[PDB]
Amino acid sequence: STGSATTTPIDSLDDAYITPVQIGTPAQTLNLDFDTGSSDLWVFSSETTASEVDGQTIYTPSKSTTAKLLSGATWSISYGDGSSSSGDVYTDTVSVGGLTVTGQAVESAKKVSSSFTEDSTIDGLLGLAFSTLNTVSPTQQKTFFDNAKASLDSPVFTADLGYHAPGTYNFGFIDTTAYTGSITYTAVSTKQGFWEWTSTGYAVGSGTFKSTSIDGIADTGTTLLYLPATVVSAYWAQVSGAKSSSSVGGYVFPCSATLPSFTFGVGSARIVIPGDYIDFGPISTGSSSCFGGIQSSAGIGINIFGDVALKAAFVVFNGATTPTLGFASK
Numbered sequence: 001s002t003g004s005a006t007t008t009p010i011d012s013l014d015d016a017y018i019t020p021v022q023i024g025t026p027a028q029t030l031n032l033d034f035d036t037g038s039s040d041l042w043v044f045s046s047e048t049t050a051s052e053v054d055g056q057t058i059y060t061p062s063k064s065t066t067a068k069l070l071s072g073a074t075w076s077i078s079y080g081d082g083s084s085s086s087g088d089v090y091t092d093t094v095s096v097g098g099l100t101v102t103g104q105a106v107e108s109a110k111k112v113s114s115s116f117t118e119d120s121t122i123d124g125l126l127g128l129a130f131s132t133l134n135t136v137s138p139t140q141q142k143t144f145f146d147n148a149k150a151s152l153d154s155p156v157f158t159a160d161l162g163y164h165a166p167g168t169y170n171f172g173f174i175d176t177t178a179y180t181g182s183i184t185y186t187a188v189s190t191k192q193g194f195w196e197w198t199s200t201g202y203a204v205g206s207g208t209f210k211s212t213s214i215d216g217i218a219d220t221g222t223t224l225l226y227l228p229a230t231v232v233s234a235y236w237a238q239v240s241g242a243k244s245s246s247s248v249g250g251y252v253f254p255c256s257a258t259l260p261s262f263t264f265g266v267g268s269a270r271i272v273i274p275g276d277y278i279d280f281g282p283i284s285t286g287s288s289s290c291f292g293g294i295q296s297s298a299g300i301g302i303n304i305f306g307d308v309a310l311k312a313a314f315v316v317f318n319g320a321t322t323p324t325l326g327f328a329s330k
């Protein structure tokens with residue numbers, strides 16, 4: 001089997017991407033944030049505290065003839081941005097882009113933190129990291145990908161995120177029309193439950209490539225690119241008037257600037273992030289200070305190849321017995 005679904009930016013900055021997901025019978029379609037940095041499929045629901053719902057589409061398990069309470073199961077998750085959610089669990093039929101899993105754990109939110117309530121565009125998350133990170137207790141549950149894997153033509157999914165444009169998530173096949181040149185594959189460690197890999201280095205604009213190992217995670221659920229402070233300082237030093245602002249919480253730059261590109265290594269290959277991808281717009285409406293898309297990972301404890309980096313590539317999440325990542329230009 002295969003599936004193919006379009007993923008669409010939630011706003012003009014590509015702050016996140018939403019993908020429609022069919023849950024239950026008859027189908028209830030929710031727009032979920034596909035997150036390769038977490039392993040829970042959770043939704044706004046008929047159980048969510050009413051004051052914490054503001055415009056989201058909700059899953060109502062009592063309206064699904066295939067929904068079954070997973071008796072005794074709870075979940076509770078805290079993300080790297082300080083957001084959180086928790087609740088109970090149903091199993092139900094979940095389809096993405098024509099690919100159907102029966103008996104998928106659908107984690108129904110009873111509580112969500114303010115950032116989720118305040119974002120009317122995201123109806124929940126679909127985790128695509130390794131199932132070892134799933135929070136359901138006392139019986140840990142599998143991701144949608146892990147449950148689909150055996151049925152797929154090839155045990156893979158791909159992320160093809162757009163810059164200010166829709167893109168695609170494919171499951172079970174590699175669309176050889178969606179990228180240029182060849183795919184370069186690189187080793188993955190699953191020891192922390194992430195798609196963790198080691199970049200071979202970086203360049204700033206037209207500068208020389210610096211060969212240096214950068215361990216990090218391919219994370220579709222993180223907006224920006226978070227890298228070691230040395231690398232980030234070297235990038236922003238090439239932008240007149242850029243500075244790290246403790247009050248704003250990262251590097252800012254004059255909105256009048258033209259940003260240089262950023263290149264990262266994948267083995268002997270190179271992925272170029274155009275400068276425009278690194279512009280996240282005014283810090284507040286009408287400000288001439290703009291927020292940078294490359295930020296320090298210092299304090300986070302891990303480097304994160306988020307959407308800024310991933311949207312410059314066609315990315316293969318290879319879930320073979322030994323997982324690997326693939327990157328192609330496009």
Ligand SMILES: CNCc1ccc(C(=O)NC)o1
Binds near residue numbers: 035038079081219221
């Ligand atoms: C786990 N991937 C999605 C997500 C939630 C919060 C964050 C984050 O803070 N990244 C820096 O990422």
